Design a binder for this molecule. Structure first.
Ligand SMILES: Nc1ncnc2c1ncn2[C@@H]1O[C@H](COP(=O)(O)OP(=O)(O)O)[C@@H](O)[C@H]1O
Ligand SMILES: [Mg+2]
Length: 394
């Protein structure tokens, strides 16, 4: 919230450097999923329509500061032109005289895609010299890549010290929804935290406990908490070194008046495989030589009931090993409960969690699916993302 956007500045006839996220999956030089390109169109179309000279910048993969032929942006330029139904110029460098000549040749409404910014070693180091070379190409900077704003790189932060800097439309949606969930939530406010390791979620659980009414835990994360309560977890994922941290979090929940929910039943398997023998058991009776890979039927029911009584729900992390169909039921049940809750606003964050919802075909039934991956989690921890801080306040 409070950042200026492209709607707040006149872009007619200005050279506009726009950081976008075109880091798409490829195989054999062909794009296999263009979702991220599609997500950038609203911003891009607005700029074209209003007469900006549009300069797009993105990274693709991890070239490590050198040219990697296979990570050039030609395929993306091609695909963008198809979607816009207008040619997209594309250079083989991102700075330098050839690039200055290409920007100079742009007319109002024209689009130019620069080569992969991570071909340059100063990008990931945030070198001011690279930042200044980028800034020399334009009049204004637009940041529409929330998934890259959590690290201070020349194209996501450095350049904003030299030009007026505003948010694109995707950036604006992420800040408004996530910002409001942390700053002024609708209540009851429930957070659902799953995934594999508590190690990965320490910051998120810590910060959400200062805000929510209810905290629900699932995934492999939950077995560290069950062990903390004195129950054996058989062969389940466990982080013994975090047992004391788990007891502190439960004590923080009590002190704050938060209702804390964890599984009452689990789906256990005799082997880590889709065709393993499985059975349902209560949480205090996990067989010593079996593994719990999903939440059970009574837990799905209980979680659905809490979701139904909440006005806002933030969910990060699968409830079980959803990659295997036999252990995907708990994850599916949470997605379906959110899709069907008439007065509950749903926010989803995390790579696997977004994938899971897409996989079940429920993405359009959710209020907001964060695009930021790791940047969404860091935002939820209460961190100040460098790319966000650099943008001007309205
Ligand atoms: N009971 C479990 N045992 C082992 N791994 C689990 C369990 N429940 C969930 N996971 C795993 O959690 C992983 C997703 O966790 P995470 O990466 O933190 O989610 P996100 O990307 O949504 O933040 C998936 O690979 C899944 O198989
Ligand atoms: Mg993940």
């Amino acid at each position: 919230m409070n950042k200026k956007t492209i709607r707040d500045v006149d872009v007619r006839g200005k050279r506009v450097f726009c950081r976008v996220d075109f880091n798409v999956p490829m195989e054999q030089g062909a794009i296999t999923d263009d979702t991220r390109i599609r997500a950038a169109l609203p911003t891009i179309r607005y700029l074209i329509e209003h007469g900006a000279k549009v300069i797009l910048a993105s990274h693709l993969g991890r070239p490590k500061g050198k040219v990697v032929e296979e990570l050039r942006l030609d395929a993306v330029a091609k695909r963008l032109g198809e979607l816009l139904e207008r040619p997209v110029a594309k250079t083989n460098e991102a700075v330098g005289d050839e690039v200055k000549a290409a920007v100079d040749r742009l007319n109002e409404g024209d689009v130019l895609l620069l080569e992969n910014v991570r071909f340059y070693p100063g990008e990931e180091k945030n070198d001011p010299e690279l930042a200044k070379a980028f800034a020399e190409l334009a009049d204004l900077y637009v940041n529409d890549a929330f998934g890259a704003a959590h690290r201070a790189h020349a194209s996501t932060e450095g350049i904003a010290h030299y030009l007026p800097a505003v948010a694109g439309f995707l950036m604006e949606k992420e800040l408004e929804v996530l910002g409001k969930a942390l700053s002024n939530p609708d209540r009851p406010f429930t957070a659902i935290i799953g995934g594999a390791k508590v190690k990965d979620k320490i910051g998120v659980i810590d910060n959400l406990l200062e805000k929510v009414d209810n905290l629900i835990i699932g995934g492999g994360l939950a077995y560290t908490f069950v062990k903390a309560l004195g129950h054996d977890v058989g062969k389940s994922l466990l982080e013994e070194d975090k047992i004391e941290l788990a007891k502190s979090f439960m004590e923080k929940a009590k002190e704050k008046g938060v209702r804390f929910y964890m599984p009452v039943d689990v789906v256990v398997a005799d082997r880590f495989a889709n065709d393993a023998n499985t059975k349902v058991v209560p949480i205090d009776a996990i067989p010593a030589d079996w593994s719990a890979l999903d939440i059970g039927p009574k837990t799905r029911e209980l979680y659905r009931d809490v979701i139904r009584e909440s006005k806002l729900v933030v969910w990060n992390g699968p409830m079980g090993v959803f990659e295997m169909d036999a252990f995907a039921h708990g994850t599916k049940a949470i997605a379906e409960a959110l899709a069907e809750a008439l007065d509950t606003y749903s926010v989803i964050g995390g790579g696997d969690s977004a994938a899971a919802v897409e996989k079940f075909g429920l993405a359009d039934k959710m209020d907001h699916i964060s695009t930021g991956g790791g940047a969404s989690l860091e935002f939820m921890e209460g961190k100040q993302l460098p790319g966000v801080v650099a943008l001007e306040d309205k």
